[PDB]
Amino acid sequence: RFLKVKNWETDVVLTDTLHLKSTLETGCTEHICMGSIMLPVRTKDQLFPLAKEFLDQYYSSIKRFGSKAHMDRLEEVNKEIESTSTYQLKDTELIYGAKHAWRNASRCVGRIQWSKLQVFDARDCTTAHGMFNYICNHVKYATNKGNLRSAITIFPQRTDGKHDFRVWNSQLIRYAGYKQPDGSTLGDPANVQFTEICIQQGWKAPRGRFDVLPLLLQANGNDPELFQIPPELVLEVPIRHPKFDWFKDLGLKWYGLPAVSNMLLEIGGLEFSACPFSGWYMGTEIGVRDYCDNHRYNILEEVAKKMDLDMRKTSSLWKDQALVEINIAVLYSFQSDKVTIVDHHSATESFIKHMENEYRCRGGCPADWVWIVPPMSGSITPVFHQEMLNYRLTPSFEYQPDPWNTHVWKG
Amino acid sequence: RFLKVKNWETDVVLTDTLHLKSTLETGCTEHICMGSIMLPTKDQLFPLAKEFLDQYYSSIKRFGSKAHMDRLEEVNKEIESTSTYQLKDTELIYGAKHAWRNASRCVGRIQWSKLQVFDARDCTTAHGMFNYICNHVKYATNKGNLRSAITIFPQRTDGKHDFRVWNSQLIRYAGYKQPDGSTLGDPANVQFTEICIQQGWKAPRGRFDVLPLLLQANGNDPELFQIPPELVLEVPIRHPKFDWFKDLGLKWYGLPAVSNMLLEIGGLEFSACPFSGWYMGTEIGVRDYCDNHRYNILEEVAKKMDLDMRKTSSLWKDQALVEINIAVLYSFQSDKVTIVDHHSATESFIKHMENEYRCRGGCPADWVWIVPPMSGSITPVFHQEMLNYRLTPSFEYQPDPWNTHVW
Ligand code: HEM
Ligand code: HEM
Ligand SMILES: Cc1cc(N)nc(CCc2cc(N)cc(CCc3cc(C)cc(N)n3)c2)c1
Ligand SMILES: Cc1cc(N)nc(CCc2cc(N)cc(CCc3cc(C)cc(N)n3)c2)c1
Ligand SMILES: OC[C@@H](O)[C@@H](O)[C@H](O)[C@H](O)CO
Ligand SMILES: [Cl-]
Ligand SMILES: [Cl-]
Ligand SMILES: [Cl-]
Ligand SMILES: [Cl-]
Ligand SMILES: [Zn+2]
Ligand SMILES: [Zn+2]
Ligand SMILES: [Zn+2]
């Protein structure tokens, strides 16, 4: 099968053949599209084909397909699986696999960068204290005094599912949220449940609007343990506006390092349940989502009020006007402080260049339009008019249940 | 068999059961989602007729009644004998309203039941088609107090006597390739304009020339007609704060009337079925004005605003976009021409969708089209999970007639 995608702005038509390598399910069928649904132990028998498929891909990529080295490796893994029910990745394979999981991440507009990922191998880690040290090192490396560098840290793979490594935080750095008796929220509403867990576990909460959460870390299936990230390692940016001098008195700031820590990395059938990865922000993630979602910091009203916009009717577009000014502020603040950030025009322009290159060299670039098109000004970015095909390639990043839902407490 | 949709803003969860009535294909498979692809005989007719008549008789609470059974037989008899059948006026009206109700890409469906249906199945000639369309335009426009309407010409027979409106919308602007290399007018309409010229239209060659209608009756060669200029309501675009905005010489038409789609009811195919509503402001200010392959005015507006256009990160494009969209809404409002802003329309759609889940068991919706082309996240549809599926009666795409027509 050849599948065509068209760009409705340029009339450029591309041909996808990479979809023939797709594996897992999309959730969709011939009768129902689930394109806007956010979320729609392995046996020996299941594991060897998965491992073989991965190794064949790896050895093709190094131009050693069918070599003695390739064949010896398949045999070595086969024997390892039959006698241990699992296998260990070589470091080169782990690097390749992590980079490919990013390259395959259909919801990621930042993939032009995929080949420049620093992979920290933490598979020798045994304890939560060990995890804490690895994570601090990751943060320091990735932050790089504001010249941000993409990185992933990979903890030991799942064995029987009773010994999982997990970062209980959804991101390495994120702000606490506190539900008040009057039903209001102090700080970030997205993190209320996790904040309550930290407090229950012993965290002394400062109870302010931007308190950096402690890490809650589980090694080897043990109960998780609390650790404070050294404050000097957490780079933050006070938010101001280039023309509006009152913007700073909103008291806004954000952290520089976006670091997703709640996803599962699948490579050759192996499951890495603790694999925090980080890049740098696109400005709308902070300006649109984190600041202006109604269930997040929800600042639109306050900003528009200070701007003295006509808020009597939605048709003045007061909400849209304020939204643009906040996003200006986020970009201005990061740039002024020399902390890496990308605006949504630059990011989507680079994505389309990446995507076209992927079509030429790889036969495709799976992409989820719902996530790729930015949450403001969609139509004026080059991804809006670009048709995309969404499908699942491995290696991959996957969602997993929050661990407090599944953890067996030891006491 | 029961599907859940979640709202990520409210945590509200809804259950869809209506998808089990879906019939046509989505284009997606278990392996690949085509959600962002824009276009992904006698034996066949009776089940479709039956499927439709069953839904109709259920709708008026007479399912399994003698009148239901008698109508089913009547239609069976008619297909057996004539190879087709004719809808009762009641069925035609129900079918057209439901094709709108079922349009998963339309944010405006809260209004679905208020549609005015003009039955033009007695039309036989292109000149007749022209008369029906002027009447639709005048009725729908209603001096700026716009009213939804559809006009339904005769159904397809053997497929070589199709009624077609060759225009993509009843009202749209000409586009002309220039010796310059640039485009004058609307680049979306370049090809259709050339066909009109080929067919003999005296083109004014200006920036906002309302295209003539090119109408095909009974599979005959299409004919050219000019909509009475006094029936085409237009709005000059100005800004409530920027006095220079009017200098750009911008205007748009008040009536959005899609005229290139096909209406399927009970297996019958209505290849000419122009329908109209009123505009959501982003359709003119974001798509028509700011797409690069449309009027592409972002740069000129930003220049007049004196924005820093050195770097994308100043968000000059976003700034000019908002101002253009303010000016569209202001202009329509000031001239008392119905228009809806994207916050109001999406709020109404969420209210409609909840109604539909509770009274109908679901509401097929295509997030890619339902989320407005600017400020997506700050509208209540962004955080709303949707299920997209195809119910009939339906509006469908069909190929442009110049690729098909035998002259
Ligand atoms: C280098 C700079 C990066 C940028 C600018 C970037 C940008 C983004 C954005 C904007 C989204 C979601 C759309 C939105 O939030 O509006 C996203 C999603 C995602 N990205 Fe990236 N990304 C970057 C690096 C990375 C890295 C290093 C990885 C992993 C190695 C990664 C993997 C993912 C994944 C798996 C998702 C989907 C998350 C989910 O489903 O919840 N990205 N990216
Ligand atoms: C009454 C006011 C109406 C409003 C505000 C409205 C709004 C819209 C919008 C905004 C879109 C496309 C998304 C976009 O342009 O950003 C759309 C698509 C559509 N609407 Fe409506 N609509 C209205 C009335 C109607 C009527 C009366 C019908 C048919 C009887 C209809 C059927 C459709 C169909 C079939 C599409 C998909 C068109 C395509 O695939 O190109 N709508 N609507
Ligand atoms: C490594 C990395 C770097 C970087 N800069 N950004 C990311 C993505 C982080 C992310 C985090 C959260 N909490 C939510 C979303 C979108 C949540 C969302 C999106 C859409 C389109 C709909 C919906 N309901 N929710 C994205 C990862
Ligand atoms: C009856 C009626 C009333 C009313 N107010 N609006 C309409 C819709 C008219 C319409 C017309 C055109 N040419 C394009 C689009 C979106 C084209 C589009 C959308 C998306 C999301 C992507 C893409 N490539 N193209 C919509 C109909
Ligand atoms: O407070 C808990 C939440 O932060 C958490 O459940 C996230 O929503 C989840 O991990 C998805 O990112
Ligand atoms: Cl974030
Ligand atoms: Cl979100
Ligand atoms: Cl339009
Ligand atoms: Cl468009
Ligand atoms: Zn799909
Ligand atoms: Zn959001
Ligand atoms: Zn467009």
PDB file of C-alpha atoms in Angstrom, chain B residues 37-167:
ATOM      1  CA  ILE B  37      -7.402  13.564   5.875  1.00  0.00           C
ATOM      2  CA  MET B  38      -9.945  15.918   4.337  1.00  0.00           C
ATOM      3  CA  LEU B  39     -11.262  13.310   1.834  1.00  0.00           C
ATOM      4  CA  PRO B  40     -10.267   9.827   3.113  1.00  0.00           C
ATOM      5  CA  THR B  41     -28.530  -0.399  -8.508  1.00  0.00           C
ATOM      6  CA  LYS B  42     -31.926  -1.851  -7.544  1.00  0.00           C
ATOM      7  CA  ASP B  43     -30.615  -4.416  -4.997  1.00  0.00           C
ATOM      8  CA  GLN B  44     -28.736  -1.759  -3.039  1.00  0.00           C
ATOM      9  CA  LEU B  45     -31.627   0.715  -2.822  1.00  0.00           C
ATOM     10  CA  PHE B  46     -34.323  -1.060  -0.777  1.00  0.00           C
ATOM     11  CA  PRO B  47     -32.262  -1.669   2.396  1.00  0.00           C
ATOM     12  CA  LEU B  48     -31.237   2.013   2.409  1.00  0.00           C
ATOM     13  CA  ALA B  49     -34.875   3.060   1.865  1.00  0.00           C
ATOM     14  CA  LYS B  50     -35.989   0.729   4.675  1.00  0.00           C
ATOM     15  CA  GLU B  51     -33.234   1.951   7.028  1.00  0.00           C
ATOM     16  CA  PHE B  52     -34.409   5.516   6.415  1.00  0.00           C
ATOM     17  CA  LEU B  53     -38.169   4.852   6.627  1.00  0.00           C
ATOM     18  CA  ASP B  54     -37.652   2.925   9.867  1.00  0.00           C
ATOM     19  CA  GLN B  55     -35.824   5.900  11.416  1.00  0.00           C
ATOM     20  CA  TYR B  56     -38.487   8.280  10.154  1.00  0.00           C
ATOM     21  CA  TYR B  57     -41.390   6.250  11.498  1.00  0.00           C
ATOM     22  CA  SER B  58     -39.630   5.818  14.796  1.00  0.00           C
ATOM     23  CA  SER B  59     -39.089   9.587  14.952  1.00  0.00           C
ATOM     24  CA  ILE B  60     -42.858  10.279  14.771  1.00  0.00           C
ATOM     25  CA  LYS B  61     -43.676   7.448  17.208  1.00  0.00           C
ATOM     26  CA  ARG B  62     -45.379   5.187  14.666  1.00  0.00           C
ATOM     27  CA  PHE B  63     -42.746   2.423  14.322  1.00  0.00           C
ATOM     28  CA  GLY B  64     -44.299  -0.921  13.291  1.00  0.00           C
ATOM     29  CA  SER B  65     -47.658   0.765  12.620  1.00  0.00           C
ATOM     30  CA  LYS B  66     -49.822  -0.011   9.611  1.00  0.00           C
ATOM     31  CA  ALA B  67     -48.849   3.363   8.066  1.00  0.00           C
ATOM     32  CA  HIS B  68     -45.164   2.406   8.566  1.00  0.00           C
ATOM     33  CA  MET B  69     -45.689  -1.072   6.973  1.00  0.00           C
ATOM     34  CA  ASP B  70     -47.861   0.300   4.114  1.00  0.00           C
ATOM     35  CA  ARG B  71     -45.213   2.955   3.287  1.00  0.00           C
ATOM     36  CA  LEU B  72     -42.459   0.334   3.280  1.00  0.00           C
ATOM     37  CA  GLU B  73     -44.475  -1.798   0.815  1.00  0.00           C
ATOM     38  CA  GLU B  74     -45.348   1.257  -1.307  1.00  0.00           C
ATOM     39  CA  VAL B  75     -41.651   2.071  -1.692  1.00  0.00           C
ATOM     40  CA  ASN B  76     -40.677  -1.535  -2.286  1.00  0.00           C
ATOM     41  CA  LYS B  77     -43.332  -1.609  -5.053  1.00  0.00           C
ATOM     42  CA  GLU B  78     -42.064   1.639  -6.544  1.00  0.00           C
ATOM     43  CA  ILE B  79     -38.367   0.589  -6.649  1.00  0.00           C
ATOM     44  CA  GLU B  80     -39.347  -2.818  -8.096  1.00  0.00           C
ATOM     45  CA  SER B  81     -41.214  -1.046 -10.913  1.00  0.00           C
ATOM     46  CA  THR B  82     -39.400   2.265 -11.500  1.00  0.00           C
ATOM     47  CA  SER B  83     -35.844   1.447 -10.251  1.00  0.00           C
ATOM     48  CA  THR B  84     -36.168   4.413  -7.842  1.00  0.00           C
ATOM     49  CA  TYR B  85     -38.702   6.087  -5.523  1.00  0.00           C
ATOM     50  CA  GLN B  86     -40.001   9.488  -4.473  1.00  0.00           C
ATOM     51  CA  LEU B  87     -39.877  10.923  -0.950  1.00  0.00           C
ATOM     52  CA  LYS B  88     -43.025  12.361   0.668  1.00  0.00           C
ATOM     53  CA  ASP B  89     -42.555  16.048   1.526  1.00  0.00           C
ATOM     54  CA  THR B  90     -42.504  15.104   5.234  1.00  0.00           C
ATOM     55  CA  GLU B  91     -39.655  12.612   4.606  1.00  0.00           C
ATOM     56  CA  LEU B  92     -37.730  15.102   2.504  1.00  0.00           C
ATOM     57  CA  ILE B  93     -37.889  17.716   5.280  1.00  0.00           C
ATOM     58  CA  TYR B  94     -36.985  15.199   7.999  1.00  0.00           C
ATOM     59  CA  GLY B  95     -34.112  13.885   5.846  1.00  0.00           C
ATOM     60  CA  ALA B  96     -32.599  17.290   5.107  1.00  0.00           C
ATOM     61  CA  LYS B  97     -32.806  18.362   8.740  1.00  0.00           C
ATOM     62  CA  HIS B  98     -31.128  15.130   9.770  1.00  0.00           C
ATOM     63  CA  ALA B  99     -28.359  15.382   7.210  1.00  0.00           C
ATOM     64  CA  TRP B 100     -27.495  18.676   8.971  1.00  0.00           C
ATOM     65  CA  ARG B 101     -27.941  17.110  12.447  1.00  0.00           C
ATOM     66  CA  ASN B 102     -25.487  14.369  11.330  1.00  0.00           C
ATOM     67  CA  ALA B 103     -22.799  16.705   9.853  1.00  0.00           C
ATOM     68  CA  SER B 104     -19.883  15.874  12.180  1.00  0.00           C
ATOM     69  CA  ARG B 105     -17.800  18.835  10.934  1.00  0.00           C
ATOM     70  CA  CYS B 106     -20.444  21.488  11.691  1.00  0.00           C
ATOM     71  CA  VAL B 107     -20.190  23.489  14.916  1.00  0.00           C
ATOM     72  CA  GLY B 108     -23.527  25.197  14.161  1.00  0.00           C
ATOM     73  CA  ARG B 109     -25.842  22.223  14.669  1.00  0.00           C
ATOM     74  CA  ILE B 110     -27.710  23.555  17.705  1.00  0.00           C
ATOM     75  CA  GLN B 111     -29.911  25.146  14.987  1.00  0.00           C
ATOM     76  CA  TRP B 112     -30.505  21.889  13.027  1.00  0.00           C
ATOM     77  CA  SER B 113     -34.278  21.640  13.546  1.00  0.00           C
ATOM     78  CA  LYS B 114     -34.990  25.228  12.435  1.00  0.00           C
ATOM     79  CA  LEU B 115     -33.926  24.631   8.804  1.00  0.00           C
ATOM     80  CA  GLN B 116     -36.252  26.009   6.086  1.00  0.00           C
ATOM     81  CA  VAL B 117     -36.483  23.387   3.324  1.00  0.00           C
ATOM     82  CA  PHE B 118     -37.387  24.554  -0.186  1.00  0.00           C
ATOM     83  CA  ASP B 119     -38.553  21.663  -2.307  1.00  0.00           C
ATOM     84  CA  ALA B 120     -37.379  22.301  -5.871  1.00  0.00           C
ATOM     85  CA  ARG B 121     -37.968  18.744  -7.205  1.00  0.00           C
ATOM     86  CA  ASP B 122     -40.355  20.183  -9.821  1.00  0.00           C
ATOM     87  CA  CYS B 123     -37.503  22.173 -11.371  1.00  0.00           C
ATOM     88  CA  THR B 124     -36.724  21.135 -14.936  1.00  0.00           C
ATOM     89  CA  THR B 125     -34.463  23.795 -16.476  1.00  0.00           C
ATOM     90  CA  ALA B 126     -31.415  25.920 -15.609  1.00  0.00           C
ATOM     91  CA  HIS B 127     -33.476  29.084 -15.707  1.00  0.00           C
ATOM     92  CA  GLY B 128     -35.825  27.444 -13.152  1.00  0.00           C
ATOM     93  CA  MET B 129     -32.777  26.678 -10.992  1.00  0.00           C
ATOM     94  CA  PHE B 130     -31.733  30.325 -11.138  1.00  0.00           C
ATOM     95  CA  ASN B 131     -35.179  31.490  -9.906  1.00  0.00           C
ATOM     96  CA  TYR B 132     -35.191  28.996  -7.000  1.00  0.00           C
ATOM     97  CA  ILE B 133     -31.677  30.109  -5.983  1.00  0.00           C
ATOM     98  CA  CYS B 134     -32.511  33.843  -6.037  1.00  0.00           C
ATOM     99  CA  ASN B 135     -35.486  33.055  -3.839  1.00  0.00           C
ATOM    100  CA  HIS B 136     -33.325  31.020  -1.459  1.00  0.00           C
ATOM    101  CA  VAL B 137     -30.705  33.852  -1.353  1.00  0.00           C
ATOM    102  CA  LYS B 138     -33.384  36.490  -0.636  1.00  0.00           C
ATOM    103  CA  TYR B 139     -35.151  34.362   1.976  1.00  0.00           C
ATOM    104  CA  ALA B 140     -31.927  33.307   3.750  1.00  0.00           C
ATOM    105  CA  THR B 141     -30.448  36.830   3.696  1.00  0.00           C
ATOM    106  CA  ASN B 142     -33.635  38.453   5.082  1.00  0.00           C
ATOM    107  CA  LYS B 143     -32.094  41.959   5.062  1.00  0.00           C
ATOM    108  CA  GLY B 144     -29.256  40.762   7.321  1.00  0.00           C
ATOM    109  CA  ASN B 145     -31.313  38.752   9.780  1.00  0.00           C
ATOM    110  CA  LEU B 146     -30.080  35.478   8.277  1.00  0.00           C
ATOM    111  CA  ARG B 147     -32.210  32.311   8.295  1.00  0.00           C
ATOM    112  CA  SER B 148     -30.880  28.786   7.563  1.00  0.00           C
ATOM    113  CA  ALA B 149     -32.211  27.279   4.358  1.00  0.00           C
ATOM    114  CA  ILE B 150     -31.712  24.496   1.872  1.00  0.00           C
ATOM    115  CA  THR B 151     -33.053  24.212  -1.681  1.00  0.00           C
ATOM    116  CA  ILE B 152     -33.367  20.649  -3.001  1.00  0.00           C
ATOM    117  CA  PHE B 153     -33.340  20.007  -6.784  1.00  0.00           C
ATOM    118  CA  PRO B 154     -34.362  16.676  -8.401  1.00  0.00           C
ATOM    119  CA  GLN B 155     -32.550  13.488  -7.331  1.00  0.00           C
ATOM    120  CA  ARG B 156     -30.087  11.570  -9.501  1.00  0.00           C
ATOM    121  CA  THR B 157     -31.710   9.076 -11.877  1.00  0.00           C
ATOM    122  CA  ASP B 158     -29.352   7.208 -14.274  1.00  0.00           C
ATOM    123  CA  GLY B 159     -26.505   9.591 -13.416  1.00  0.00           C
ATOM    124  CA  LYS B 160     -26.471  11.241 -16.860  1.00  0.00           C
ATOM    125  CA  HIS B 161     -29.274  13.695 -16.015  1.00  0.00           C
ATOM    126  CA  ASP B 162     -27.735  15.196 -12.849  1.00  0.00           C
ATOM    127  CA  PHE B 163     -28.708  18.595 -11.553  1.00  0.00           C
ATOM    128  CA  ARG B 164     -25.571  20.364 -10.383  1.00  0.00           C
ATOM    129  CA  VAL B 165     -24.581  23.806  -9.202  1.00  0.00           C
ATOM    130  CA  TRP B 166     -21.069  24.110 -10.602  1.00  0.00           C
ATOM    131  CA  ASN B 167     -20.178  26.860  -8.078  1.00  0.00           C
TER     132      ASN B 167
END
